[PDB]
Write an enzyme that holds these catalytic residues in place. Structure first.
Site, mmCIF file in Angstrom:
data_model
loop_
_atom_site.group_PDB
_atom_site.id
_atom_site.type_symbol
_atom_site.label_atom_id
_atom_site.label_comp_id
_atom_site.label_asym_id
_atom_site.label_seq_id
_atom_site.Cartn_x
_atom_site.Cartn_y
_atom_site.Cartn_z
ATOM 1 N N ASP A 211 0.825 -1.232 0.000
ATOM 2 C CA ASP A 211 0.000 0.000 0.000
ATOM 3 C C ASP A 211 0.855 1.276 0.000
ATOM 4 O OD1 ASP A 211 -2.687 1.260 0.362
ATOM 5 O OD2 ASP A 211 -1.686 2.018 2.156
ATOM 6 N N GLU A 286 1.516 -0.862 -4.995
ATOM 7 C CA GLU A 286 0.559 0.225 -5.314
ATOM 8 C C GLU A 286 1.296 1.564 -5.241
ATOM 9 O OE1 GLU A 286 -1.453 2.639 -2.858
ATOM 10 O OE2 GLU A 286 -3.409 2.636 -3.850
HETATM 11 O O1 LIG Z 1 -3.705 3.450 3.101
HETATM 12 C C1 LIG Z 1 -3.748 4.646 2.330
HETATM 13 C C2 LIG Z 1 -4.641 4.563 1.095
HETATM 14 N N1 LIG Z 1 -4.209 3.520 0.130
HETATM 15 C C3 LIG Z 1 -5.398 2.809 -0.375
HETATM 16 C C4 LIG Z 1 -6.572 3.695 0.008
HETATM 17 O O2 LIG Z 1 -7.788 2.968 0.019
HETATM 18 C C5 LIG Z 1 -6.114 4.201 1.371
HETATM 19 O O3 LIG Z 1 -6.911 5.292 1.817
#
Ligand SMILES: OC[C@H]1NC[C@@H](O)[C@@H]1O
Ligand SMILES: OC[C@H]1NC[C@@H](O)[C@@H]1O
Ligand SMILES: [Ca+2]
Ligand SMILES: [Ca+2]
Ligand SMILES: [Mg+2]
Ligand SMILES: [Mg+2]
Ligand SMILES: [Mg+2]
Ligand SMILES: [Mg+2]
Lengths: 570, 570
Positions: A211, A286
């Site tokens: 993430d 991501e």
């Molecule tokens: O964790 C931070 C961000 N990355 C994915 C999103 O859904 C989230 O708010």
């Protein structure tokens, strides 16, 4: 000529990867909240769909401020989703069905309700420097008037700096006030990330989605005369100083140091795969970033190796219903032109942070978009609902629960920010709450079109998005899709082709009219296409059924019409 | 199988087009100024180089404020360049040698010393409304201060509005104060443009370059309640209200109405060609704009037909020494992906308004860039000097004569704006003023490297930029280059291939290391390349000479190294 044998690929190089949003997939216990027993009950769906691997959005202990991306305990399951035992059952049954299971790893930040943060705020030994803690900026103009360390803006609006009365210092939050950024220059933080990954790999996870990696590291005050440097101002007049877009994130995003952490994670994972054997465990990163910064996630010119791949968000960021066939070709070519040699390509059409694929594009484009996903080389990524063409759900201001909408928006503006429309419960059937729940009281409202758009209806009816999805995941077993070359060009402003070819194996050709108008094209311009050829898959609105024979080199396609043709080997 | 026959292309579809800057090509009369007798004396150079068509920068009567782009009489020759008789002699001798000759048509604006402007400023009947004349913007609060009609900024800095004391109104100038914008909503102006083009076609011109077309039409005050609307502010802090970049040219550039003028010019030119026969007369449009606005010059989805092509400036605007092989491939693919079906592609590496090709890229890349130009499908465009690898010349503040530099810059900044470095006299030989003139007093200083970089030296030495240029223009006679398919991909961050292929005809392959580092590539990855293959052309410091046999599938290329391989037919 006998069809050549191909060397079978490691599972992750051509898997169909499905993103589950657990809160909205299946509610087993009537609380209107999706849960792990719900997922277990429908693991058969992934076999039926031709999905190889599932990744779940976060299911760890969380106050749910950012619906799981605010984690208070990285080592246990969120009670609303179930128990550690439910998670072990999910892994066992998923594995029995031959599925791979990836967890959402959130290394950038922890809940302010985590033991990490409570101990850090209390300055307990070993936790004092676990997060980015900063003194107020000295104020020579009016000494002791409290200034934030810098002008940095949170992704959810407002300052990225939050005052702690207890510690008499600011902490950094790139996300919500409740999401506290770890210090990735602290070796104890880096050790804890290995501890978390080892725990879940040891449980039998097949790897992780990583993430928010662009936000890992921010400028060191040691490099800026002992202060946090201000980000440059954008100068865009529509943004005031508390509004995302006011700054250019030069000192807060895409720092070269973040990639060294990713390469260290990959080194650890390679060592773990070597020592444990079995199926390769993988990391998919991501990050929304420019092409240069995105490709550095694969590795660097020094030969460091990073994520198995960074997600390709081009079908979210760079294409929409405003795009023509030439735009489709030029954007598809971007990943394939810039990706390092030996890299595995991937294709993402949606996620829980963006509007649903048929809303971003058009309802009559669903089949063509799923064909692109499945027929391009490498890995197809599907977001929950794309396999049945789910549309954004209507969510009122009153029913909105997304912190991003609540913090950046008001009743008049919330629709510009809210991710809730893409998180509405999954449409299993035409029963109460579309079969997501036995309760009418679901955590987000069920979309109004579930009678028209649901899995059971599409499994019964002769022609459907889901039957097309099934035909396409089945086609990926063919050597032409796993090992074939690709050729992609526009025939017009309206229609493009994508040809997968491999000497001695069948040729597959996508023809897609992405426009709102009929188009006539000359199939003689399509490389490696000899007629007659057979329709393998057609859009649900196509006059052509599967098994239809294309004999004329002149082909008229209606608005949004897509065909996959099966043609003789080259 | 015997080689297939190809249908002859109309000359303009695959010509080598050379831009002459007459002031800097050849001085025949010792005044230090290039002239028509000079061009006539060297028409043989174009035959020797394998150039098919020349276009000259402006040679019409002009006060020379913008060195010919400020025209005072569109029907006669600038006295410093020669006479109408000299121009007619140039056409006769060029045509006798088989060359096409295009003129620079400047429709957007006239000199303030033109009879059009003198008469218009005097409100003479038939001329009053020939230019864009506007009253001051009402200043109700402060009526002793005259306000310009709008905030519009000139391309050469300052207001785009100049007060006329004689007329007690402002006139529009998108370029210099002395370059007055015609009113392209005036039917009498549109007819005068046909009259000018017909005049020069009747003299025997083979067509025109169309200057500065994005600036033809500006917002009609009738659409903005009787006032010229302000362009939106950029908000960029480095630009004050008198500096180009202060505004976004929403109301002053790329208006959809300009294309209707271009389509009318093409209709006129088609009718002229129909009524005259002989070689097709053509128009090539100049405009720096985004991809959508550039492609509209070819025509539109409703079937309108515009310029034979708009110039492709991508090697000027989007590639440089900062670019890697993946950038080269992705930018080359932009024209080929977005150009309409049946459009002729073209490739521009320089002009008199931009730094010279080897200065924007590197000195060691000259051959590779000339190979891209000649081997890509369609029309190669060469700017005076690229055939010998001329570099930007040093020009001091004292020797600077470019109005854009003199208006926007000062002794400390001028170099950021000046076009003069790309306009230094052509290097014929190592004689006085590099053989451009018998005089030392050249209108711009001769570059300091002329003893090292000159045409005579490159004709005497065994390997040279010019000899490579000759080999490449010769190669374009081959069916594989006139009619062949193309395939282009990057092998690494450093090296890309470009393959021209055509069944029964020889295959030609460019391999180009655009990086500052060596690269080893697997030629097995290059489609349609069977080894052994023969080096047709090599960059002047390549280890490989023309005639060298490539036998190994592993190829090491130096930084900047470029090869054309000749390989067996597909
Ligand atoms: O964790 C931070 C961000 N990355 C994915 C999103 O859904 C989230 O708010
Ligand atoms: O005529 C306006 C502009 N177009 C070409 C440039 O050299 C000139 O200043
Ligand atoms: Ca961080
Ligand atoms: Ca104009
Ligand atoms: Mg539940
Ligand atoms: Mg958003
Ligand atoms: Mg002269
Ligand atoms: Mg091919």
């Amino acid at each position: 000529p006998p069809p050549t044998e191909v060397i079978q690929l490691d599972w992750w190089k051509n898997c169909v990867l499905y993103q589950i949003y657990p809160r909205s997939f299946k509610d087993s216990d009537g609380d209107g909240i999706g849960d792990l027993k719900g997922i277990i009950s429908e693991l058969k769906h992934f076999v039926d769909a031709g999905v190889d691997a599932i990744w779940m959005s976060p299911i760890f202990e969380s106050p749910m401020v950012d619906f799981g991306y605010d984690i208070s305990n990285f080592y246990d399951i969120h009670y609303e989703y179930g128990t550690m035992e439910d998670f072990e059952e999910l892994l066992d049954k998923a594995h029995e069905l031959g599925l791979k299971v990836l967890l959402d790893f959130v290394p950038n930040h922890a809940s302010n309700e985590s033991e990490y943060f409570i101990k850090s705020e209390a300055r307990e030994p070993g936790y004092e420097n676990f997060f980015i803690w900063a003194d107020p900026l000295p104020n020579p103009e009016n000494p002791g008037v409290r200034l934030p360390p810098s002008n940095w803006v949170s992704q959810f609006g407002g300052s990225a700096w939050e005052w702690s009365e207890k510690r008499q210092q600011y902490y950094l939050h790139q996300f919500a006030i409740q999401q506290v950024d770890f210090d990735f220059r602290n070796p104890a933080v880096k050790q804890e990330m290995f501890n978390i990954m080892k725990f879940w790999l040891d449980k039998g996870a097949d790897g992780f989605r990583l993430d928010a990696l662009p936000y890992l590291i921010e400028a060191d005050p040691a490099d800026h005369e002992g202060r946090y440097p201000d980000d440059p101002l954008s100068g865009l007049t529509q943004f005031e100083s508390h509004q995302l877009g006011y700054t250019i994130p030069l000192y807060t995003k895409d720092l070269i140091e973040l990639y060294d952490v990713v390469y260290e994670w990959r080194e650890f994972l390679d060592e773990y795969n070597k020592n444990h054997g079995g199926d390769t465990r993988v990391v998919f990163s991501e990050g929304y970033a420019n092409v240069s910064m995105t490709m550095l996630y694969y590795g660097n010119e020094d030969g460091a190796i990073g994520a198995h791949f960074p997600f390709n968000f081009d079908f979210i960021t760079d294409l929409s219903s405003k795009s023509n066939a030439r735009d489709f070709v030029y954007i598809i070519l971007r990943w394939l032109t810039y990706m390092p040699y030996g890299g595995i390509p991937n294709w993402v059409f949606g996620n829980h942070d963006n509007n649903r694929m048929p809303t971003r594009f058009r309802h009559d484009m669903v089949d063509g978009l799923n064909i692109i996903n499945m027929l391009l080389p490498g890995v197809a990524v599907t977001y929950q609902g794309e396999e049945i063409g789910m549309r954004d759900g209507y969510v009122s201001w009153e029913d909105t629960v997304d912190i991003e909408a609540c913090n950046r928006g008001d009743p008049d503006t919330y629709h510009l920010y809210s991710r809730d429309p893409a998180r509405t419960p999954y449409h299993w059937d035409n029963s109460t709450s579309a079969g997501f729940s036995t309760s009418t009281n679901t955590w987000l409202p069920v979309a109004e079109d579930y009678q028209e758009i649901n899995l059971a209806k599409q499994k019964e009816t002769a022609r459907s998005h889901f039957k097309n999805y099934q035909a396409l995941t089945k086609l990926r077993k063919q050597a032409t899709l796993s090992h074939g070359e690709y050729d992609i060009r526009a025939l017009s402003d309206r229609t493009f082709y994508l040809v997968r070819s491999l000497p001695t194996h069948d040729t597959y050709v996508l023809l897609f009219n992405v426009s709102e108008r009929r188009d006539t094209v000359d199939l003689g311009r399509v490389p490696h296409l000899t007629l007659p050829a057979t329709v393998y898959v057609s859009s649900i609105h196509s006059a052509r059924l599967a098994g239809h024979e294309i004999t004329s080199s002149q082909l008229s396609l209606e608005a949004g019409e897509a065909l996959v043709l099966k043609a003789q080997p080259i």
